[PDB]
Design a protein around this nucleic acid. Structure first.
Ligand SMILES: Nc1ncnc2c1ncn2[C@@H]1O[C@H](COP(=O)(O)OP(=O)(O)NP(=O)(O)O)[C@@H](O)[C@H]1O
Ligand SMILES: Nc1ncnc2c1ncn2[C@@H]1O[C@H](COP(=O)(O)OP(=O)(O)NP(=O)(O)O)[C@@H](O)[C@H]1O
Ligand SMILES: Nc1ncnc2c1ncn2[C@@H]1O[C@H](COP(=O)(O)OP(=O)(O)NP(=O)(O)O)[C@@H](O)[C@H]1O
Ligand SMILES: Nc1ncnc2c1ncn2[C@@H]1O[C@H](COP(=O)(O)OP(=O)(O)NP(=O)(O)O)[C@@H](O)[C@H]1O
Ligand SMILES: Nc1ncnc2c1ncn2[C@@H]1O[C@H](COP(=O)(O)OP(=O)(O)NP(=O)(O)O)[C@@H](O)[C@H]1O
Ligand SMILES: Nc1ncnc2c1ncn2[C@@H]1O[C@H](COP(=O)(O)OP(=O)(O)NP(=O)(O)O)[C@@H](O)[C@H]1O
Ligand SMILES: [Mg+2]
Ligand SMILES: [Mg+2]
Ligand SMILES: [Mg+2]
Ligand SMILES: [Mg+2]
Lengths: 290, 277, 292, 292, 292, 294
DNA sequence: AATTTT
């Protein structure tokens, strides 16, 4: 497996150095490139040859950053007063257990049931947490439940997929099973042929139940047992005040950094059987610093 | 982050100087470029490379203008103004709307970035929206009657105006992100990605679009969710066809006069964001 | 402000010279370019860059000639009872004098919200003939694509009149027509140049059937009828024409508008406060004595 | 209108020389170039620019040799009772002389609004064969593509004839069909461009069933029918043809039209004073002695 | 006609030499080129110009080899009783001599209007195997794509034969199908291009049900019955084939056709006077003495 | 068959060497290229010409590798106990003889099994049907998946692929013709996107469905017209015994153990079935299974 | 872009 000779001219070396500079500075989107450095962007976008290099460098940097180290490294790079822990205790759940669950889920280590399902009443802290999580990974994709024919664009290459108000029909019910479970497969692209998506973490929030397939309008639960084998649920019960705002990067970063000095002793025992619904908190709250 | 050493050819510096000239002279469209400097347009439009450079320079100048200062700086007799007389005839107080729009176009008045027009047909509703959109650097137009492909061509524009549409069910949730002003990703029906970061929106429509229609029966539980941050404006009895189209200089003078007025009335109005003024 | 200090290669100066030559000789179409100077057209068409230069130069010349310079002047560069257009107008029992004044005031955008002009009637009534005769007199005119579904209003930007012929208001593009027909500026996609910000142009529509009934996929609705009616001017053609009238040339339009230009601008001013849907019928004591 | 003083490179001179050679050797299609000069085709097809030059040169040669020359001159150049077309026309109970005169006058756009010929009848009767034989003598002919409802009327610009073989008018493209069949200048969109300004082209249509009825989804409408019959002339082909007839040749139609041109024109004018939808049948009284 | 004197550079000469080499070695497809000379193919595929040259050279070589030459010469080049095709035809109750003679006549567009050969029967009877056996002997063969509904007749220009495997005619492509199976020169539509001139090619169709019944929506119509019947010759296959017969190679086709051609033809033109929709059966009293 | 005497340049020679490198190092895909030789990928991806050369070299390497040698050589290639193989245990649990299945899939991957060109796995959910199919599909040099909702283009992905996979296969009425043509396994031509048609010389197909597929759906109803014809070109397996959430995504390296063993033993039990195939795979024989696994 | 796409 010795590398090819290659060598390369000055342009190749300059492009490789630019890719390294982008990767080491945590720049992964065009807007971040514009904010961080404007002179380089303006110089590069002055010609067709320069404009072609922008997309190539961006995707190469994204791939190198994603493949070289796991997402946990990115998510890690007052403890009992953060917004996340307050919300989670309000919704009657142990923050530590779900934190361990998400840390395992991002790295594709939750077995077949590698998904986060959010079922609950509307306007009760559902999409806010999902968006806060999704903004911390280098890049995230959004699944299109509609159009019945291109429902999985911009999924390949991304490090996490997000679903809102999910509606699942039989035409996606079993096709999306591998994506929900993180199995490698091939997904088509517009004006292209297949993309070979290798499996990504998936989080879905829905007001209505999704395990029943909408058979046009009758909504027949033919794939009853099929869908529930892929996702684990985390129900939402109570409401919250309308002045919470954006949960930002710092709070979620600290919340995920919390689970770096404790032990997961309950998780491995809970890992023996994957419950369809996450077990609520009963009498195991009040961590020494809570 | 430390800048990267990217010493380029002379063409790069020429493009940089061209972009600087475009941004300094407030030229943000092809028509203004042709009106001001026809020689440069003719010189550049002689080859594909020149056309590409023109397009890239326009986009970069627009972005530099937008992401440098808030848009109000691009805007900053009293009764003789046409807009004053229109709102007086539209039985609405011009002062409250003037103080509201300035905060609404700054992306800082909380999450209250929503304007919308409906009511009597042929009553000066496209005129005001067009005059407002002619004052921002650039505006983006898209309809809402498709209710399946309605957010195409909205990224990169300071303000988005919808001169048509009807609210359907399939896109109830997605608008709740764009109307709210939160970053999201939407389809474009010919391309793939959008990465829209959220921008102020103005929509004008004629028919009943107020209800969040679910097929035929409106499910009003979702209406309040939009309603916390969907302050509405309504028009009234039709206008004479002599006024025509309102220009942009009068808008400048009107907003400049309204800038120095009291800000306490709107702050007191801010406690209760009623859906009708 | 101060013009930018750009320096261009000799090829760019040659391009500018060609643009100036095109503007001075009033050449705004490819066919006219072939008729006048075929040698240079053949010279340019050797390579792809030549074709690109041809298109760019044509568009630039059209814009340079069209800026300022109200369109009516282009129609006034050059007895009257024997005029074919006048005879056709009398055949339909309409005033040949008021129609000319309305055309003059409408092609310069000095009309108001009534930016359109509808030609309605049974087949073989000269609607298309008159529409094309009016169209060919302006520098350049566009047309609405009948079925493209992605660029329905292409060939509109950079023009002077739009002769939407056989017309039907598709429910897919009903709201774009609601904006184009009104004359207010709007932006549309233009085959690579996404968004165009059209300034607005006068419109003429011909049809054998009513176009205010928008087809709703399969059925026909009436919700949009009032809005379209508010900004349209109708004109009813009823009498069948002779089988061998022939095509109306540019000279007939030139003569008719030249005659209508230098007369009393007062009857239109009387019929300027109220813009009724349809033109009034012919009146005995309202025609010029030269027509009597 | 003094032509531009610009002068091109040597490659442009070679392009002009090739265009002149193509125009003066009566080569208008790729097949003629392939079977006349294979070497030049092979040398040009070695790169993209060569193919572009090929296409542009062919189009320019078409324009040079077609402009300001009536089409019938190309059709015009022994016994007459043994001509295949004459026998076929006599079998269908039509006057060959009148049909020949009508075809000669129709191809020159000198028939007013009757710009379309319609061949109607049961299968295996000779409509397609005769239509193709007529269409094979013009400098170049274009065909309307059947099932592409996004660019339904491509391949029409530049061509001197349009053939609609086995055509049915659909409600999606009926406006464009009405515009094209009329025989008036319009603007139709083309690939890699926008609009082409086709100045009217004669059309021939062959069908087994009625086409005035317009299909739409699963229902047939008759609103457009009365607005179409004025643009068409109908010929009824009934008598079945023998299997050994073979394909007609351009020589047969050339001889037939050359003979038909030199005869009397009074009967055709007498019929043409009032054009009718249906072509008059054979009149045994006229019965030119050369065909008795 | 005097050939053009314009010469080319070394690249054009090399391209022409490559075209001649491709023509002389009977390399008419990419697979054969890769199989024979992989080194040159690898050398060429390293740039866009190389791929363009590959496509152009292949097309030009195919045209040069297949022009002004009967197609049957490619079909034509041991006991005949043991040939697999002969045994299959005997098992199907047909005369191999007559079928081979009809195939030879049909392939060189010399079978009148009967320009379509149809195979009909229950599943697993050898229809597709035989159809593809004679499709690998012609230089290049084309396939009609099943589900496109917008470009149903790509890869048909330049091919010497067309195969329709498991084909059913939908109501939206019946006109184009009729035009193609007619076997007359027409013009078709191509992606990224504007119409190619197809001079008519033989078509062979295999199906399990009846294709003369046109499917429209969810129902079946029989309006287009006689027109489709006039252009086809139908063969009936029954009796299930051996489970391990294999794939019929081109050597079997060549041997069978050479033997069929070497004999007489007097028994063929007896039936060729009146072509029938149904192929005549086998009578034990008329077989060639070799097969008795 | 004298080759053309054309002389290449330095760039062409470099491209040929790169193609040889790709063919030798078994890199017949793009992700493997990024994983193994990332720096060269970055050097090549700095221009349009390099981007074109990447695809050209990949296609040429795939063709050169798969042109002559049968795919069974790629599968076999090249030791723990035989009973330790997870696939063997699963097949035994499903009441099937692993030897017969291994021999059949070795013969089927080379198109040596007559008209039978499709493998069908039928069973209730969670019996381990997708895992085995994907494990087999990960051993071939390159595989394709038919499009799920692309009704206009249901077979775009099958173009120069060693195997095609159809998960949750449901056959509609408007796809039956193309589906039958592809499943037949004969040299055909299929339409791509944005371009003309390409040639497919026949590709083995593996399918996985939770319900019957010989019953074809039409609009909203079901018809059995295309029943015998589809059954004429399929071999069916039943996975009735449900499994436990234990098998962690069976890797490709398992099949090398399973197939190499199966090819080792004598074949004088499969040809007794290969003379006359059946629609359904014969069940388990108690007094015939190889004692090395009992 | 046109095709594909609905
Ligand atoms: N645009 C916004 N800006 C700030 N906070 C918001 C916004 N939209 C919603 N929220 C907050 O999010 C919570 C409920 O909204 P949301 O997150 O959408 O709940 P949901 O169940 O996902 N629907 C409340 O705390 C709101 O204050
Ligand atoms: N093309 C035009 N040129 C000049 N003035 C115009 C034009 N169109 C409209 N106006 C004027 O603008 C005012 C209102 O026009 P308009 O913008 O159409 O209102 P509208 O409510 O959006 N039309 P509608 O959609 O029927 O409700 C009136 O004073 C009109 O005279
Ligand atoms: N190609 C033509 N050449 C010459 N004169 C023509 C031609 N087409 C139409 N005419 C003349 O124009 C008259 C009818 O005008 P026309 O262009 O058909 O307008 P129209 O009434 O709108 N027809 P239609 O669009 O079907 O309703 C005919 O009677 C002819 O005298
Ligand atoms: N491929 C062919 N080769 C030779 N002669 C042909 C061919 N096709 C048709 N013919 C002759 O043309 C006669 C029928 O004319 P045809 O071209 O079918 O016109 P048509 O009546 O329009 N047929 P159709 O279009 O099917 O309704 C046949 O009897 C043949 O003599
Ligand atoms: N892929 C294949 N490999 C080997 N032999 C094959 C193959 N396909 C078919 N055969 C042989 O060909 C025989 C029948 O050929 P076949 O192509 O099925 O005829 P067919 O009836 O036209 N097909 P069908 O359309 O399903 O009826 C089979 O019995 C086999 O002997
Ligand atoms: N992503 C995964 N990670 C770990 N184990 C998995 C995964 N996907 C499937 N499995 C295991 O594979 C076995 C069954 O998977 P599978 O092959 O999908 O059965 P199946 O019946 O084919 N499901 P389906 O294809 O949707 O009908 C179980 O033991 C699962 O635990
Ligand atoms: Mg008309
Ligand atoms: Mg026909
Ligand atoms: Mg078959
Ligand atoms: Mg599965």
């Amino acid at each position: 497996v010795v590398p090819f000779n290659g060598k390369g001219t000055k342009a190749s070396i300059k492009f490789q150095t630019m890719v390294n500079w982008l990767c080491e500075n945590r720049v992964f989107t065009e807007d971040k490139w514009k904010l961080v450095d404007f002179n380089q962007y303006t110089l590069l976008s002055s010609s067709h040859s320069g404009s072609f290099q922008i997309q190539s460098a961006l995707k190469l940097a994204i791939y190198k950053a994603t493949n070289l180290v796991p997402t946990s490294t990115f998510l890690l790079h007052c403890i009992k007063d953060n917004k996340i822990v307050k919300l989670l205790l309000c919704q009657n759940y142990d923050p530590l257990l779900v934190g361990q669950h998400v840390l395992k889920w991002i790295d594709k280590k939750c077995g077949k049931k590698n998904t986060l399902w959010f079922y609950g009443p509307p306007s009760t802290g559902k999409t806010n947490l999902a968006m806060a999580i999704a903004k911390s990974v280098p890049v995230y994709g959004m699944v299109n439940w509609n159009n019945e024919n291109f429902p999985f664009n911009d999924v390949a290459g991304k490090s996490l997929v997000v679903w809102d108000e999910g509606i699942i029909k039989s035409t996606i019910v079993e096709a999306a099973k591998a994506i929900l479970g993180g199995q490698p497969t091939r997904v088509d692209q517009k004006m292209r042929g297949s993309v070979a998506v290798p499996g990504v973490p998936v989080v879905i929030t829905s007001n209505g139940d999704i395990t029943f397939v909408v058979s046009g309008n009758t909504t027949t639960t033919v794939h009853a047992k099929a869908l529930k084998e892929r996702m684990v649920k985390l129900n939402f019960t109570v409401r919250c005040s309308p002045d919470m705002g954006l949960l930002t990067e710092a709070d979620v970063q600290q919340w995920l950094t919390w689970c770096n000095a404790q032990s997961w002793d309950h998780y491995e025992n809970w890992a023996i059987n994957y419950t369809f619904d996450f077990p609520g908190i009963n009498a195991d709250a009040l961590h020494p610093d809570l």
